[PDB]
Amino acid sequence: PPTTVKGRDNYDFYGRVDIESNPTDLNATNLTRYNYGQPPGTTTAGAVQFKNQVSFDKDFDFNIRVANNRQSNTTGADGWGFMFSKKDGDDFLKNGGILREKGTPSAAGFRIDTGYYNNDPLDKIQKQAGQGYRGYGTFVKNDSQGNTSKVGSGTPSTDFLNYADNTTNDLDGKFHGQKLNNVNLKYNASNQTFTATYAGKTWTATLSELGLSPTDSYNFLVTSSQYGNGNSGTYASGVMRADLDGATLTYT
Ligand SMILES: [Ca+2]
Ligand SMILES: [Mg+2]
Ligand SMILES: [Mg+2]
Ligand SMILES: [Mg+2]
Ligand code: NA
Ligand code: NA
């Protein structure tokens, strides 16, 4: 029978990730926080890893609220990577994830991209360069050599998202990415399909498209990073936050 799990104790912490006990700008406590107190660079990356492994002969359902930095895509973090990998968080710190052009081989998952990188071909396809808070969502996979590619549903037009805005109101019925908002990542074993929802948008990819094994065991990691884009010294805190304590994960 499946198990549904909630609590920080179910996750190991790797890299530049900590707990912000008493946020001043969000109605929350004990948020998991990435990229804090370190400038952009190769080691500015973090992951939480669910302590038990999952496999794609059974359903999987993960829900977590995330709040993006209210920082432009040339100053803030790279985004969020909800990643399946046969390797652990230290492998992610060494070899990268799913937020750039290359990361750890044969991983895959859902990318909420909030940071522009001049050498990322997908950022060019998605028209990420520009003013405001320009980003995108999509499933991606890393091939056996680590190269990242878009897989599954979407076009540049439909993948696009404004990952934050300059407003504060909580009354307009709209998505505001700097607030806490649910990300749902679901795997339906019956139709071998992954679904991701965020910001009122949906993405779909098959198991085949993600390239993952139908039976091998996988780790699940929630990742962020702020690896840097050049040497100008232009950056902000890159602080990305998730309510890991309030997340739910259903698996078998
Ligand atoms: Ca990007
Ligand atoms: Mg608002
Ligand atoms: Mg958000
Ligand atoms: Mg399939
Ligand atoms: Na407002
Ligand atoms: Na930072």
> Domain spanning 3-251: which CATH class is it, in words?
mainly beta
Lookup result for tokens 């050049």: 230
Distance 126 CA to ligand 1 centre (A): 9
Q: How far from each other are the two terminal CA atoms of the chain, in whole angstroms?
A: 6
113 is in an annotated binding site: yes
Tell which residue, 129, 135, 145, 47, has the closest CA to residue 88.
47
Residue 123: how many other CB atoms lie within 10 Å: 22
Alpha helices in the chain (DSSP H): 89-95, 121-125, 156-159, 207-210
Question: DSSP letters along 57-101, please?
Answer: TS-EEEEEEEE--SS-TTTS--EEEEEEESS-HHHHHHH--SSSS
Lookup result for tokens 């609220």: 65
Q: Map out the domains of the chain as residue ranges.
A: 3-251
Q: Angle at the Cα of 8 (from 185 to 93), degrees rounded to 5? A: 70
Q: Residues 214, 58: contact at Cβ < 8 Å?
A: no
Q: Which two tokens stand for residue 204?
A: 């779909």
Q: Which ligand is nearest to the CA of 178?
A: 3
Report how far Cα 216 is from the mean position of its chain's Cα atoms.
Answer: 22
Residue 115: how many other CB atoms lie within 10 Å: 31
235 is in an annotated binding site: no
Q: CB burial class (10 A; 0-12, 13-18, 19+) of residue 126?
A: buried
Alpha-carbon distance values, 20 to 37, 227, 243 (Å): 12, 21, 10
Tell which residue, 64, 85, 117, 88, has the closest CA to residue 225.
117
Lookup result for tokens 């702020």: 226
Q: Residues 196, 145: contact at Cβ < 8 Å?
A: no
Q: Which ligand is nearest to the CA of 118?
A: 1
Distance 243 CA to ligand 3 centre (A): 11
Q: Which method resolved this structure? A: X-ray
